[PDB]
Design a protein around this ligand. Structure first.
Ligand SMILES: Nc1ncnc2c1ncn2[C@@H]1O[C@H](COP(=O)(O)OP(=O)(O)O)[C@@H](O)[C@H]1O
Ligand SMILES: [Mg+2]
Lengths: 371, 70, 70
């Protein structure tokens, strides 16, 4: 048989068969419903629209994200998303395919318990497993040591791993992610004169952020340059024409990652959290961690992020140390690649959670050695 | 009598529209390539400056080492 | 009638021809910028290795001087 690797993530579900080079199906994890009445008779539109389909009918629907920050809030729509992924995008019955899932660090145990219960009862998969995103990301890069920073759309976490031995006491989780950056961009664009309120226009703002934003190596100098020069302004085309222009907001939005105080968060920037996490570890493994800093997640795709991160860490770390940041081109798909590699290992075949083992041990078995 | 003129005008409009659409598509391609190249060159220019500072301080403490060895 | 539509089509065709010319001009500028950036990156990325080996042997005989001093 073959194993199935699915990554719910947050804001982007990516699924495929184990052993493949890239995920087969990638689509937003969005469930939408029609807020209007509808007058045509015989159209027979269905109640809910899931996945990329709901994107095409954005103007008529209202969208809801089942995942806020890693955790799942609404379960019925999550079940709908899983069913759509299994039956429509992959067109494979899950009755004979082990499923590997990715789960962020430091989340409620009830999340895993309900996930496994739903997967074992609703779909009756023969077996399934849950793994941490950071470990899979490290698998994909081919490394075995080094601190990995995974910054998705829901949560950003640093997990230091040395010689394949994780250090749980040094794991650091921060709720700042891509969704908060999009919200801050929505809030800041009002200054120029553009107002976005409808959940549909959240997607337009997200597209603007993806295709236009960039990270500045130095902040005050860039502000001074923008205050005088006009070489930074760029124009974007909305779906219905009405071109808009954007200047400072081009690079102010990502700076929230390094300056959480913009959005009122008390915590420090991601660079400072990474340095603190490295220091929280022992003293004999800091060399490799400094020299094997790994980045992953969609939010990390900002151009120029690596240079700023390296500059900040070098400013923090001792000068004698060498700081290197690994930024593969396929950052956002690193987790799924790592999961595919892990599911294809021969030694992993005995670490699945079997059906009858699940039944006799109960839903809590997920928290035993079969982590 | 004017039917042939209208047909010719429609054909010319279609040809011009197709040429224009090709012009855009190609312009977007070129602009995307130019933006990517500009970003890459700027990033490696920043790398150039940081490695230049590294090299400068390298000669600095190398000279310090030189006299202390003297 | 048909005359108004014909005149409008011709005038719109004129604006689209102007836009086509502008597109060609912009793409020529973009190609010039792209080739200039290509030359610049070629220079930078063929001097980066020189800088790298420079700092390499810099720290080499830095270490030699330090151990001799010790
Ligand atoms: N090139 C990019 N520029 C800006 N943001 C990006 C880019 N690529 C991805 N993102 C952001 O990453 C998020 C998706 O993260 P993803 O890799 O799916 O991790 P997860 O599935 O855990 O959220 C999106 O919300 C998007 O805003
Ligand atoms: Mg993720």
């Amino acid at each position: 048989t073959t194993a199935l690797v699915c990554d719910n993530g947050s804001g982007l579900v990516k699924a495929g068969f184990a052993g493949d080079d890239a995920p087969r199906a990638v689509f937003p994890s969005i469930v939408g419903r029609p807020r209007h009445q509808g007058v045509m008779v015989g159209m027979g539109q269905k109640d809910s629209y899931v996945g990329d389909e709901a994107q095409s009918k954005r103007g008529i629907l209202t969208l809801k994200y089942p995942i806020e920050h890693g955790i799942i809030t609404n379960w019925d729509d999550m079940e709908k998303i899983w069913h759509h992924t299994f039956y429509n995008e992959l067109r494979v019955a899950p009755e004979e395919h082990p499923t590997l899932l990715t789960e962020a660090p430091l989340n409620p145990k009830a999340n895993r318990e309900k996930m496994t219960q739903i997967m074992f009862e609703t779909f009756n998969v023969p077996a399934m497993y849950v793994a941490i995103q950071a470990v899979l990301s490290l698998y994909a890069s081919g490394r075995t040591t080094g601190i990995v920073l995974d910054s998705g759309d829901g949560v950003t976490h640093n997990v230091p791993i040395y010689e394949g031995y994780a250090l749980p006491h040094a794991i650091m989780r921060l709720d700042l992610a891509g969704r908060d950056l999009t919200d801050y961009l929505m809030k800041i664009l009002t200054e120029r004169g553009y107002s976005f309120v409808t959940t549909a226009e959240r997607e337009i703002v997200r597209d603007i952020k993806e295709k236009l934003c960039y990270v500045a190596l130095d902040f005050e100098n860039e502000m001074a340059t923008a205050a005088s020069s006009s070489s930074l302004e760029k124009s974007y085309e909305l779906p219905d024409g009405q071109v808009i222009t954007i200047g400072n907001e081009r690079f102010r939005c990502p700076e929230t990652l390094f300056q959480p105080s913009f959005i009122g968060m008390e915590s420090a920037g991601i660079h400072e959290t990474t340095y603190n996490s490295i220091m929280k570890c022992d003293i004999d493994i800091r060399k490799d961690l400094y020299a094997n800093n790994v980045l992953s997640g969609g939010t990390t795709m900002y151009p120029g992020i690596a240079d700023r991160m390296q500059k900040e860490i070098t400013a923090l770390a001792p000068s004698t140390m060498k700081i290197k940041i690994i930024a593969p081109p396929e950052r956002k798909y690193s987790v799924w690649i790592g999961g595919s590699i892990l599911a294809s290992l021969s030694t992993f075949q005995q670490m699945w959670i079997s059906k009858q083992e699940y039944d006799e041990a109960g839903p809590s078995i997920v928290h035993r050695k079969c982590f | 009598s004017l039917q042939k003129k209208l047909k010719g005008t429609e054909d010319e409009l279609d040809k011009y529209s197709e040429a224009l659409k090709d012009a855009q598509e190609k312009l977007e391609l070129a602009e995307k390539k130019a933006t990517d190249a500009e970003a890459d060159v700027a990033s490696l220019n920043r790398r150039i400056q940081l490695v230049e500072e590294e090299l400068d301080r390298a000669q600095e403490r190398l000279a310090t080492a030189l006299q202390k060895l003297e």
